Paper text:
Protein tyrosine phosphatases (PTPs) play a critical role in regulating cellular functions by selectively dephosphorylating their substrates. The ∼280 residue PTP catalytic domain consists of an α/β structure, and biochemical and structural studies have led to a detailed understanding of the catalytic mechanism (Barford et al., 1994; Zhang, 2002). Key features of the domain include the PTP signature motif, the mobile Trp-Pro-Asp “WPD” loop that in the closed conformation positions the conserved and catalytically important aspartate residue, and the phosphotyrosine recognition loop. Here we report the crystal structures of 22 PTP domains, including two tandem-domain RPTP structures and a detailed structural comparison of this protein family.
Also within this category are RPTPγ and RPTPβ, which have the secondary pocket with a basic residue albeit with bulky residues in the gateway region. The basic pocket is also found in the phosphatases RPTPγ and RPTPβ; however, the topology of the region differs in these phosphatases in that the gateway region is inaccessible. PTPs with particularly high enzymatic activity against generic substrates were RPTPσ and PTP subgroups R5, R3, NT1, NT2, NT3, NT4, and NT5. CD45 and members of subgroups R3 and R5 were extremely promiscuous and dephosphorylated most phosphopeptides with reasonable activity. All members of the R3 subgroup as well as RPTPγ were highly active, and it will be interesting to establish how this activity is regulated in vivo.
Numbering used by the authors: 1687 to 1967
The structure:
Amino acid sequence: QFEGHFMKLQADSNYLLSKEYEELKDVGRNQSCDIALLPENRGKNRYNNILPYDATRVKLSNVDDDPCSDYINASYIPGNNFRREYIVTQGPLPGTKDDFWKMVWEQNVHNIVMVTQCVEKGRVKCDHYWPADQDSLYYGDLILQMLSESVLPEWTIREFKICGEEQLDAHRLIRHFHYTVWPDHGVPETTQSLIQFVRTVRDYINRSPGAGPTVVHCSAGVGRTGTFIALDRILQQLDSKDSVDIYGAVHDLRLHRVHMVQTECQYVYLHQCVRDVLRAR
Ligand SMILES: [Cl-]
Ligand SMILES: [Cl-]
Ligand SMILES: [Cl-]
Ligand code: NA
């Protein structure tokens, strides 16, 4: 079973756990990121070393006169159910926030997951890319209105109405799930916190059939974002199988985007979450 597997991984000061994590290090990394490296796109990446692969990047519709107008730092990611179950992205920049909302619109996104604060330890990690109040705003040609904001202990849930300017009756409801307690150092203090957050989000995702991919982001869109997605996938497997494959999930993530589950600590945390679920049952 899982508990015995994890016991063996943790034996000898996590020796086999480390070895397994290190086996994933080169996965996916021979893939080109030439589009992301075009000079015209340079300002559109938050981090030089976190770029989407050409094979898996999300494309925006082209705006005439600008061939590089298709670019956003964003990647498609598989889950248990669909090949493009998620779109992962960086925390938007002031200059990419209209692109972000354009992607949300064009990809039929109904659910957005944000696993960061805008500022952490005095560093800007993500722009405040959504409305501050209930007054509506255009991001490019898209109209956005916050209908509700619910500040809970460990997350904030917001509802937005989005529509194109030239068709006001064809609007969409979008939910935004903002995990607000990820600590400045390490991983969350409890497994309970991220497990409950993931299950909360999943229960909303299951009630949005016909939606496009779920957007997940943090600052770079790799570590916390990858941990969120891996956890979502493995908790579904547990509920269904119950046959958990944490290694396989992280491997598949790495094929789609660099650094997904970016630290060994996050990889350990995934194993702890699953153990804790099983212990509670
Ligand atoms: Cl290049
Ligand atoms: Cl699939
Ligand atoms: Cl798909
Ligand atoms: Na692609």
